A paper describes a structure:
Cyclic GMP–AMP synthase (cGAS) is a cytosolic DNA sensor that produces the second messenger cG[2′–5′]pA[3′–5′]p (2′3′-cGAMP) and controls activation of innate immunity in mammalian cells. Together, our results define cGLRs as receptors in animal cells that are capable of detecting diverse pathogen-associated molecular patterns and dictating response to the foreign environment.
Despite divergence in the primary sequence, the hMB21D2 and T. castaneum XP_969398.1 structures each reveal close homology to human cGAS with a shared bi-lobed architecture, a caged nucleotidyltransferase core, a Gly-[Gly/Ser] activation loop and a putative catalytic triad. A conserved groove is present in both the hMB21D2 and the T. castaneum XP_969398.1 structures, but is notably distinguished by the absence of a Zn-ribbon and the insertion of a C-terminal α-helix in hMB21D2. We hypothesized that the remodelling of this groove controls the detection of distinct ligands. The hMB21D2 surface is overall neutral with no obvious capacity to bind nucleic acids, and no enzymatic activity was detected with a panel of potential activating ligands. Our structural analysis also reveals that the human cGLR MB21D2 is competent for synthesis of nucleotide second messengers and has a remodelled ligand-binding groove that is probably adapted for detection of an unknown stimulus. Together with the known high frequency of hMB21D2 mutations in cancer, these results support a more extensive role for cGLR signalling in human biology.
Author numbering: 28 to 430
The structure:
């Protein structure tokens, strides 16, 4: 009976959730806060070194690392960090290097050489102090006629952001080490700076990302404001559409030195309050299954799976999403969606639906993942049973170091 197959997945999804959820005691909670406090003070000292970072800055801390697909970043060409082996808890931190207003969108966002969901950032119309403050981090474009333009470069900013962190941390290393978190690793992986801190028994991974902060909602995502979504009535619209980000990632066509990617990372944090726990549990189970065998050569990012999980919140009324016994049906629905998107090489962005997030995949690689997915679809409980063992093994690796 197919009802017996549903109960088996419901049991495995519930068992997977038991070992996947992070529960910290009072000791681990202080170890995490001490590491976060050191990161925040480090960024404060980075602002004191070069007066480039804003004096009044607002960071965005997320519970997962970049390689876990928490933000729309290009996960390819990123070295792999294993939980329990290299870190015990992972985090990503968006550090705004610039703060702009809603009125500054049509005059600073240059999207004439960029695909959808991407843009250049023109600093031409800023005051002379800001232009001179970021002149070394911009792509200067001189013209025979017309004003010289300054495009905020994601590459130059990342190198400066990494050098500033390296300088601040190197000075702290000279002074005696008492009460300071032992820095396990400092690496510049593309436009991402990864720091592993050792505070007590646990190790913390922080993927710090240099970001451009914007106030208001993107003009290219205007249509997303014109339909009633699932969060309508459960959370206030002001908390969702109050701002967006520019993440240092380019499209497969754009210029790596000039192009940013629009990120709705803080809109999704507010939307997580409305997503049902059952659909969320199936998402975490589906993520632990596919990202293993669907990562090479061109990985399908967990953010691609997060978008489909978000798409499933609107196309689907709250009734079927509410009942907890339908967790197996949610996991299979995400697998069927991950099949349809691969077959047509089409995965629309949840906030900018006309943006295809799979246009960078070749026809060969997307067919290979579709054949690998058919083996997962035919036996979803077995791939989930293996994913539970990978989480239990990582939970004992972290515990062995804490013990």
């Amino acid at each position: 009976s197919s009802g017996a197959r549903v109960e088996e997945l419901n049991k495995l999804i519930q068992e997977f959730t038991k070992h996947d959820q992070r529960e910290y005691d009072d000791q681990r909670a202080l170890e995490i806060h001490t590491a976060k406090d050191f990161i925040f003070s480090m960024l404060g000292m980075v602002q004191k070194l070069d007066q480039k970072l804003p004096v009044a800055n607002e960071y965005l801390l997320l519970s997962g690392g970049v390689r876990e697909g928490v933000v729309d970043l290009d996960l390819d060409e990123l070295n792999v960090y294993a939980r329990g082996t290299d870190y015990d808890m992972d985090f990503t931190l968006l550090v705004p290097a610039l703060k702009l207003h809603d009125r500054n969108q049509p005059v600073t966002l240059d999207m004439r050489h960029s695909a959808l969901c991407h843009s250049w950032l023109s600093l031409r119309l800023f005051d002379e102090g800001t232009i001179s403050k970021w002149k070394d981090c911009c792509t200067i474009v001189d013209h025979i006629n017309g004003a010289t333009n300054y495009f905020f470069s994601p590459t130059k900013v990342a190198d400066w952001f990494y050098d500033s962190i390296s300088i601040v941390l190197s000075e702290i290393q000279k002074k005696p080490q008492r009460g300071m978190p032992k820095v396990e690793k400092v690496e510049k992986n593309g436009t991402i700076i990864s720091i592993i801190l050792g505070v007590g028994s646990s190790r913390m991974l922080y993927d710090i990302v240099p970001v451009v902060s914007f106030k208001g909602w993107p003009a290219v995502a205007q249509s997303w404001l014109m339909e009633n979504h699932f969060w309508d009535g459960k959370i206030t619209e002001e908390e969702v559409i109050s701002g967006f980000y520019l993440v240092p990632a380019c499209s497969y066509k754009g210029k790596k030195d000039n192009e940013w990617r629009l990120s709705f990372a803080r809109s999704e944090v507010q939307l997580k309050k409305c997503i049902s726990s059952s659909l969320m549990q199936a998402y975490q189970a589906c993520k632990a299954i596919i990202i293993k065998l669907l990562s090479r050569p061109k990985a399908i990012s967990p953010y691609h799976l997060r978008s489909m999980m978000l798409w499933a919140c609107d196309r689907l009324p709250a009734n079927y999403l509410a009942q907890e016994d339908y967790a197996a049906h949610f996991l299979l629905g995400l697998i069927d969606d991950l099949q349809h998107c691969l077959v047509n090489k089409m995965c629309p962005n949840y906030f900018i639906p006309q943006c295809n997030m799979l246009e960078h995949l070749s026809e060969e690689t997307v067919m290979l993942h579709a054949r690998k997915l058919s083996s997962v679809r035919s036996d979803p409980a077995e791939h989930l049973r293996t994913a539970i063992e990978h989480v239990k093994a990582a939970n004992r690796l972290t515990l062995e170091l804490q013990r």
